[PDB]
């Protein structure tokens, strides 16, 4: 049993870490939460503190206002009966306004207005959280990478729920809120546009999605394999290359004939993942607005 | 047609991206060299990027890459063949000499610092409030190498203060001196700590540290280097 | 020929087969015994494909396709041009993948690192083997395996899925997709954290892992840690490919009806089956 660094053999605990103070307004950080020994076998045992400024409460609130909206509707659809609710949970669905109403905010509450309300709550939840992304990084003097990458996820989501429905002239074109129904939505979207397999942006997007699993498997495994020379201390291995970063480059270079740097590998990483939603959103955005049929479009590129 | 405009632009943007990425990944180890240290002829189709400079945080300096490259250390190996592409035989004891899978780099001879400028790693005994919170506490266990001989006893754990994690066991020898073993190379069991990499007689050979309450990056390399090397080089005695 | 710090690692030893016989590099590439294995199996495979090409009739890559024996051949051989070429290419691919791994193990022993990479690779090899060997065997025919062509294998993906309705309703295919998506989440996050530390605000100095922990706790109340994140990527990755193999191993074998209908077990539970209202 040669050991693998997948689970910790011994946990070690010290005084709670209240973290770095940079330009952060400490008035908004809570106090430390508890310490999970369970979590601790795999990563850090410490919960919190969390920073909750004004934008944080906004996000957390409208967010919470996005999830009760769908939930009263789901509860209605159950006829207020709790055993039905559980039974039919994946079946309930909050559908958007019918095609007759185009982009109007007119549609009755019980037949599309609730959709828009929840959507509204979601819109301000996601963008305010995006702000939070940038601002926590500013206060720490860090680069803006997290926010840029998160923007790429926002792009797909924006395009499905908001931009594409607008460009197509109606909210009926947007995605319902339900577990099964959003899946149906997806299958049907493909059927109606001549099969997304013919959409070259769909293919790219798969390429990066699979690519992400490939890269993160590679990366994670590589770092764990050189964790016997401190390889996970990636920032210092950036500033002063050790044997960990050398032995890792060189496994790849002996394997496939080229390699990364400790820093470089993270660039491959951010881009591999980000391109999933970058290409994905373009592909959706062009569907029905410019290409009614990917098969057909494909026959002429 | 707009969608074939989009896909064509994208392939172009993607070629530029691979270019950026691949050159970004040349800020170390390049230029390529012949087995004897001189610049190789075929450097590949990618040019080196324009230098960048990281500012280090604790009065600790700059790093600028690409930059002049050198091992800053003797490499006890010699060629075993008359042309490019073969193994280089250890000219001495490879464990002692720091070659092969016993290699270390000439990293800085100072310790890694936390965000507050303190030593990142301390022995637990000098780490205020720090204690084992779960799993078998190794302290006091005998340490056994791959010959199934006892090589000493655990006398503390060195802990990463900011990440609250075990990084080394400090082990005492018949001698009364101690060595660090990397936490990742030991198996803690209920009646012992087992070390498959090293045989009892190779413990004394583990590179030692100059101060008993801190380790420099240079020292960590030599130690980690040395114990990983034993998986190949202690294999006779295993 | 060498990275500037490479020489000190290029030592004899590590090999699993043949001692020093194949212990050498060609340019940057190490060469196992398993370097030879993978060249042989790969080259043979490629030749057999350039060939299966001329017998089906092209030299264009979006067209070239190689189909398994048709369903009637069961689990037995089939004339070269009528699917045996595929059978043999499959043997060759398995040949090259397993070697590539074993070669990886050899590189690991030489570098004195752990086996985590080739181990991870092994999950991919098992996904492939599920599609071309384990599923087809449990099913009676090489004909259920997918064919080797850029666009034709997508046809297969689509015919195989729609045979069970909307494949979304495969529950294990659901777990698996979660893992892929979460993985890409973690990958964007991991990359952006490390990078936003190493390339901070500008004129400013490199941040630290404490900064990285701090950023995450500020943002979401928790931070997994630089060891954790790499334990996590690995797990999320492999889990996704594991549940991928699970979702197809069970399809056409223990479950062969419309996947949507499977969920009827939940809704038909006695305590709430007959109660009225709701969707059902
Ligand atoms: C996994 C579930 C399905 C499947 C579903 C899909 C779907 C759905 C799609 C693809 C797509 C792809 N699939 Mg497929 N694919 C399957 C199994 C395979 C296997 C295999 C050996 O098992 C291979 C080699 C491929 C290869 C491919 C590529 C041609 C393409 C992009 C993959 C990628 O980037 O992944 C991540 C890997 C990397 C980023 C590493 C780079 C790998 C390179 C690009 C692969 C080159 C393969 C070469 C063309 C064929 C080998 C010939 C050699 C000379 C021997 N698929 C199974 C049957 N695959 C997409 C496509 O656009 O097709 C037109 C697409 O939409
Ligand atoms: C039969 C079904 C169709 C099909 C129809 C579609 C459709 C329709 C779409 C895709 C999309 C995708 N498909 Mg396809 N897909 C098919 C077949 C496949 C196959 C295959 C055959 O094996 C594969 C591997 C894929 C793979 C993929 C992905 C590459 C791509 C989604 C990227 C992503 O990360 O989304 C996940 C990421 C997001 C959804 C962004 C999330 C961002 C927001 C901001 C998160 C908000 C969180 C919110 C606050 C709530 C959280 C609560 C928290 C706990 C607090 N498809 C077939 C042909 N596919 C998407 C795409 O891009 O297409 C080009 C898409 O729209
Ligand atoms: C990408 C094309 C489709 C789509 C196709 C699918 C498919 C296909 C599946 C899911 C599944 C999921 N999708 Mg969906 N999904 C879409 C966009 C979304 C959006 C959004 C735009 O805001 C949300 C909030 C969700 C939410 C969900 C969850 C119910 C589930 C797990 C997500 C996850 O693992 O994230 C990661 C991490 C978190 C921490 C949260 N989907 C678009 C419209 N989604 C899977 C599921 O199991 O449903 C039961 C599943 O199989
Ligand atoms: C219309 C089609 C159906 C559908 C039918 C199927 C079918 C059918 C299958 C999947 C499978 C998958 N589907 Mg589904 N699926 C649909 C919609 C989706 C959607 C979506 C957004 O709607 C998503 C995200 C997914 C996602 C997924 C994944 C869980 C999985 C693909 C990855 C995998 O297994 O890789 C594992 C990786 C591999 C197999 C690659 C192996 C690589 C090998 C080992 C080495 C290759 C080396 C190469 C040759 C070398 C080249 C040379 C160098 C490049 C130089 N499906 C729709 C509803 N889906 C597949 C699955 O589960 O497979 C087990 C599967 O068979
Ligand atoms: C398990 C997690 C993920 C993963 C991990 C993973 N992949 C890996 C590794 C790891 C850890 C490696 O170490 C190894 C590597 O070297 O990466 C650079 C690798 C690898 N994964 C690769 C590809 C790959 N991985 C994929 C997926 C995944 N890999 C999972 C998502 C996919 C997908 C999703 O489609 C592909 C395409 C290669 C880049 C590399 C393995 C290279 C190799 O084995 O070389 C040997 C063989 C050849 C060079 C020649 C071709 C073989 C011939 C017999 C003929 C062709 C066969 C036939 C099946 C063609 C099919 C045609 C297609 C159109 C379908
Ligand atoms: C680049 C592509 C991948 C991606 C990236 C991504 N997501 C992100 C980020 C980034 C870079 C964030 O910074 C942000 C975050 O805070 O992560 C902890 C986030 C986020 N991604 C989330 C979810 C999410 N991301 C998804 C997917 C993806 N995001 C893609 C795979 C999905 C999918 C696949 O369905 C989901 C469900 C949240 C954890 C968070 C945004 C939370 C938010 O907006 O708050 C509203 C509050 C409540 C509902 C309560
Ligand atoms: C921090 O650490 C880390 C590094 O290091 C510092 C690393 O580099 C890497 C590696 C990651 C990268 C370098 C980023 C780029 C990687 C990807 C996007 C993954 C995809 C990989 C490919 C597209 C290329 C795969 C190419 C292969 C498999 C090589 C085959 C090439 C040929 C044409 C010939 C093959 C040779 C044979 C037949 C072998 C036998 C030898 C003889 C010649 C005989 C990681 C993960 C890492 O974490
Ligand atoms: C336990 O009960 C209570 C009442 C406490 C609350 C419970 C609520 C429940 C169970 C809620 C369920 C929520 C679900 C299932 C939500 C599902 C969302 C899904 C699956 C997908 C959404 C995709 C959305 C998109 C693409 C929308 C984007 C919107 C915009 C761009 C706005 C313009
Ligand atoms: Fe990393």
From Swiss-Prot, chain A:
UniProt binding sites for (7R,8Z)-bacteriochlorophyll b: 182, 202
Positions annotated to bind Fe cation: 219, 234, 266
Membrane topology according to the record: Multi-pass membrane protein
InterPro entries: Photo_II_D1/D2_sf, Photo_RC_L/M, Photo_RC_L/M_CS, Photo_RC_M
Keywords: Bacteriochlorophyll, Chlorophyll, Chromophore, Electron transport, Iron, Magnesium, Membrane, Metal-binding, Photosynthesis, Reaction center, Transmembrane, Transmembrane helix, Transport
Binding locations of a ubiquinone: 252
Molecular function per GO: bacteriochlorophyll binding; electron transporter, transferring electrons within the cyclic electron transport pathway of photosynthesis activity; metal ion binding
Transmembrane segment boundaries: 53-79, 110-139, 142-167, 197-225, 259-285
Main location: membrane
Name assigned to this protein: Reaction center protein M chain
Species for this entry: Cereibacter sphaeroides
Gene (name only): pufM
UniProtKB/Swiss-Prot annotation, chain B:
Pfam family, one: PRCH
Xref: CDD domains: PRCH
Record keywords: Bacteriochlorophyll, Chlorophyll, Chromophore, Electron transport, Membrane, Photosynthesis, Reaction center, Transmembrane, Transmembrane helix, Transport
Membrane topology: Single-pass membrane protein
Cofactor note: Binds 4 bacteriochlorophylls per trimer.
GO biological process assignments: photosynthesis, light reaction
UniProt GO cellular component terms: plasma membrane light-harvesting complex; plasma membrane-derived chromatophore membrane
InterPro entries per record: Bac_photo_RC_H_C, Photo_RC_H, Photo_RC_H_N, Photo_RC_H_N_sf, PRC-brl_dom, PRC_barrel-like_sf
Ranges that cross the membrane: 2-21
Location(s), subcellular: Cellular chromatophore membrane
Cofactor: a bacteriochlorophyll; a bacteriopheophytin; Fe cation; Mg(2+)
Gene Ontology molecular function, alphabetical: bacteriochlorophyll binding; electron transporter, transferring electrons within the cyclic electron transport pathway of photosynthesis activity
Primary location group: membrane
Residue ranges annotated as Cytoplasmic topological domain: 22-238
Family of this protein: Belongs to the reaction center PuhA family.
Subunit-level organization: Heterotrimer composed of subunits L, M, and H.
Biological role stated in the UniProt entry: The reaction center is a membrane-bound complex that mediates the initial photochemical event in the electron transfer process of photosynthesis.
Protein name: Reaction center protein H chain
Species annotation: Cereibacter sphaeroides (Rhodobacter sphaeroides)
From Swiss-Prot, chain C:
One BP annotation, GO: photosynthetic electron transport in photosystem II
Entry's localization field: Cellular chromatophore membrane
Domain of life: Bacteria
Periplasmic face residues: 56-82, 139-170, 251-280
Binding-site list for (7R,8Z)-bacteriochlorophyll b: 153, 173
Spans traversing the lipid bilayer: 32-55, 83-111, 116-138, 171-198, 225-250
Binding residue positions for a ubiquinone: 216
GO MF annotation, one: electron transporter, transferring electrons within the cyclic electron transport pathway of photosynthesis activity
Name of a matching Pfam family: Photo_RC
Keywords: Bacteriochlorophyll, Chlorophyll, Chromophore, Electron transport, Iron, Magnesium, Membrane, Metal-binding, Photosynthesis, Reaction center, Transmembrane, Transmembrane helix, Transport
Cytoplasmic side: 1-31, 112-115, 199-224
InterPro entries, per database record: Photo_II_D1/D2_sf, Photo_RC_L, Photo_RC_L/M, Photo_RC_L/M_CS
Family from the record: Belongs to the reaction center PufL/M/PsbA/D family.
Function according to Swiss-Prot or TrEMBL: The reaction center is a membrane-bound complex that mediates the initial photochemical event in the electron transfer process of photosynthesis.
NCBIfam families: pufL (TIGR01157)
Record's protein name: Reaction center protein L chain
């Amino acid at each position: 049993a040669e050991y693998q660094n997948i689970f910790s053999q011994v946990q070690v605990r010290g005084p709670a870490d209240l973290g770095m103070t940079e330009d952060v307004n400490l008035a908004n950080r809570s106090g430390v939460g508890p310490f999970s020994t369970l979590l601790g076998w795999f990563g850090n045992a410490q919960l919190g503190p969390i920073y909750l400024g004004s934008l944080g409460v906004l996000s957390l609130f409208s967010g919470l206002m996005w999830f009760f909206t769908i939930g009263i509707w789901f509860w209605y659809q159950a006829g207020w009966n709790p055993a039905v609710f559980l039974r039919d949970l994946f079946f309930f669905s909050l559908e958007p306004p019918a095609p007759e109403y185009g982009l109007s905010f007119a549609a009755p509450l019980k037949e599309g207005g609730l959709w828009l309300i929840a959507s509204f709550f979601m819109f301000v939840a996601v963008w305010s959280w995006w702000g939070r992304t940038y601002l926590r990084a500013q206060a720490l003097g860090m680069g803006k990478h997290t926010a840029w990458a998160f923007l790429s996820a926002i792009w797909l989501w924006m395009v499905l729920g908001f931009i594409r429905p607008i460009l197509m002239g109606s909210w009926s074109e947007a995605v319902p809120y339900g577990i099964f129904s959003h899946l149906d939505w997806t299958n049907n979207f493909s059927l109606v546009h001549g099969n997304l397999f013919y959409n070259p942006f769909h293919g790219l997007s798969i390429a990066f999605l699979y690519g992400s699993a490939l890269l993160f498997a590679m990366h994670g495994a590589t770092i764990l394999a050189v964790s016997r020379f401190g390889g996970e201390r990636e920032l210092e291995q950036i500033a002063d290359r050790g044997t960990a970063a050398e032995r890792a480059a060189l496994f790849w270079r002996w394997t496939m004939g080229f390699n990364a740097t400790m820093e470089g590998s993270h660039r491959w990483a951010i881009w591999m993942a980000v391109l999933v939603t970058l290409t994905g959103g373009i592909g959706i955005l062009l569907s029905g607005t410019v290409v009614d049929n990917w098969y057909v479009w494909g026959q002429n590129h | 047609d707009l969608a074939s405009l989009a896909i064509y632009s994208f392939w172009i943007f993607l070629a530029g991206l691979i270019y950026y990425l691949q050159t970004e990944n040349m800020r170390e180890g390049y230029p390529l060299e012949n087995e004897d240290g001189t610049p190789a002829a075929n450097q590949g189709p990618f040019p080196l990027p324009k230098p960048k400079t990281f500012i280090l945080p604790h009065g600790r300096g700059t790093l600028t890459v690409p930059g002049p490259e050198s091992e800053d250390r003797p490499i006890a190996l010699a060629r075993t063949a008359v042309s490019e592409g073969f193994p280089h035989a250890p000219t001495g004891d490879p464990m002692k000499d720091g070659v092969g899978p016993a290699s270390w780099v000439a990293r800085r001879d100072l310790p890694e610092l936390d965000g507050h400028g303190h030593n990142k790693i301390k022995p637990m005994k000098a780490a205020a409030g720090f204690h084992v919170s779960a799993g078998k506490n190794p302290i006091g266990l005998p340490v056994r190498g791959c010959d199934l001989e006892i090589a000493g006893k655990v006398v503390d754990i060195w802990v990463d203060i900011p990440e609250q994690m075990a990084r080394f066991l400090e082990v005492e020898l018949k001698d009364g001196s101690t060595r660090l073993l990397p936490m990742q190379m030991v198996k803690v069991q209920s009646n012992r700590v087992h070390v498959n990499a090293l045989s009892s007689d190779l413990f004394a050979g583990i590179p030692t540290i100059k101060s008993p309450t801190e380790v420099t990056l240079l020292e960590e390399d030599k130690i980690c280097g040395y114990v990983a090397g034993g998986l190949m080089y202690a294999a006779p005695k295993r | 020929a060498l990275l500037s710090f490479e020489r000190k690692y290029r030592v004899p030893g590590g090999t699993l087969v043949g001692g020093n016989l194949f212990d050498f590099w060609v340019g940057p590439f190490y060469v196992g015994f398993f370097g030879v294995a993978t060249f042989f199996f790969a080259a043979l495979g490629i030749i057999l494909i350039a060939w299966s090409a001329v017998l089906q009739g092209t030299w264009n890559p979006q067209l070239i396709s190689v189909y398994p024996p048709a369903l009637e051949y069961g689990l037995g051989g089939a004339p070269l041009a009528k699917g045996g070429l595929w059978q043999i290419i499959t043997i060759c691919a398995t040949g090259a993948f397993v070697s590539w791994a074993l070669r990886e193990v050899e590189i690991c022993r030489k570098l004195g690192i752990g086996y985590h990479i080739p181990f991870a690779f092994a999950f991919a090899i098992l996904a492939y083997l599920t599609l071309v060997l384990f599923r087809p065997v449990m099913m009676g025919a090489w004909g259920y395996a997918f064919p080797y062509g850029i666009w034709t294998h997508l046809d297969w993906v689509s015919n195989t899925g729609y045979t069970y309705g909307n494949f979304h309703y495969n529950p294990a295919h659901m777990i698996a997709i979660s893992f892929f998506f979460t993985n890409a989440l973690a990958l964007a996050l991991h990359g952006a954290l490390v990078l936003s530390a190493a390339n901070p605000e500008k004129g400013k100095e490199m941040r630290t892992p404490d900064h990285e922990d701090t950023f995450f706790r500020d943002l979401v109340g928790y931070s997994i840690g630089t060891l954790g994140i790499h334990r996590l990527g690995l797990l999320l990755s492999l889990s996704a490919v594991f549940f991928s193999a699970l979702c197809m191993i069970i399809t056409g074998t223990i479950w062969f009806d419309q996947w949507v209908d499977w969920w009827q077990w939940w809704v038909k539970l006695p305590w709430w089956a007959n109660i009225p209202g709701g969707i059902n």
